[PDB]
Design a protein around this ligand. Structure first.
Ligand SMILES: CCCOc1ccc(S(=O)(=O)N2CCN(C)CC2)cc1-c1nc(CC)c(I)c(=O)[nH]1
Ligand SMILES: [Mg+2]
Ligand SMILES: [Zn+2]
Length: 289
């Protein structure tokens, strides 16, 4: 109750003071407590505390719960990565102007999903995984003192819970590759329409992958640092091939996604832009072997 006390007691600086609206945001210099505050600020400015009557001590306790159920011993797949995915969701919603295209319940679900989508990850070297992540998510959402959805009606609740699940499931890269075909194909023909339930759900899945991979879009000194973390998990847990690997990952997985995303909303362009700049940096490196 120590950590809970001083998080509950704390005052929560604005979104601007916290820089959680910048696509180029980083957390390297933030204490855990500070990340907890940033996360509170996120729920608040998306109007989630308002519209769904969340009690402060419950939201605080829920966040500390999510944080605790990530493992420090894992280099990349930990609370910070979860934290950053949620921040990128937030920036895409505000700066990227995606808030306008989605319902409140969807937004609530995307935020929770981003924060929870890798819960209890033990490292890439230890959609099966995603089902286990959603499980952790549910268990926490139903824990006494932690019920941040209690204010929702049973209908709202069921709808939110189903969306949370699809969102976490969507972070299986396998699922992303299988489904992106239809997404790119739709946009290609200027047919993509969010008001169709089926495409709406597809977009939420793609948005999830986009935030999940947002590290690839960060300013070069930041991306280099993060790439180092994922290298630590990949190879040590538990010529240099990495720059070539990164260029491959960017080509196969990242570029088209961020291209499609900016097509949906011109203001997500920075994600695309940061990704390209990073490809440039990794390719130069690759050519020196
Ligand atoms: C940086 C050191 C090496 O890093 C990588 C190496 C290879 C590939 S991969 O496309 O071949 N592929 C993915 C599926 N699978 C796990 C097998 C490999 C991806 C990464 C990588 N992934 C992510 C997302 C977790 C980020 I964000 C990132 O910056 N880099
Ligand atoms: Mg995952
Ligand atoms: Zn992830």
């Amino acid at each position: 109750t120590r950590e809970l006390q001083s998080l509950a007691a704390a005052v929560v600086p604005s979104a601007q003071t916290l820089k959680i609206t910048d696509f180029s945001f980083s957390d390297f210099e933030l204490s855990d407590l500070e990340t907890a505050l940033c996360t509170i600020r996120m729920f608040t400015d998306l109007n989630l505390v308002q519209n769904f009557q969340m009690k402060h001590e419950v939201l605080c306790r829920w966040i500390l719960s999510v944080k605790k159920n990530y493992r420090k011993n894992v280099a990349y797949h930990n609370w910070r990565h979860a934290f950053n995915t949620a921040q990128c969701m937030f920036a895409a919603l505000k700066a990227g102007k995606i808030q306008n295209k989605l319902t409140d319940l969807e937004i609530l679900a995307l935020l929770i999903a981003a924060l929870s989508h890798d819960l209890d990850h033990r490292g890439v070297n230890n959609s099966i995984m995603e089902h286990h992540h959603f499980d952790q998510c549910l268990m926490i959402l139903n824990s006494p003192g932690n019920q941040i959805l209690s204010g929702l009606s049973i209908e709202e609740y069921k709808t939110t819970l189903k969306i949370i699940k699809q969102a976490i499931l969507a972070t299986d890269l396998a699922l992303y590759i299988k489904r992106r075909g239809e997404f790119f194909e739709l946009i290609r023909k200027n047919q993509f329409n969010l008001e169709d339930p089926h495409q709406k759900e597809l977009f939420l899945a793609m948005l999830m992958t986009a935030c999940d991979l947002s590290a690839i879009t960060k300013p070069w000194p930041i991306q280099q640092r993060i790439a180092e973390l994922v290298a630590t998990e990949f190879f040590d847990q538990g010529k240099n091939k990495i720059p070539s690997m990164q260029v491959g990952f960017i080509d196969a997985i990242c570029l088209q996604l961020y291209e499609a995303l900016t097509h949906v909303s011109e203001d997500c362009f920075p994600l695309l832009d940061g990704c390209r700049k990073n490809r440039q940096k990794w390719q130069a490196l690759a050519e020196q072997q």
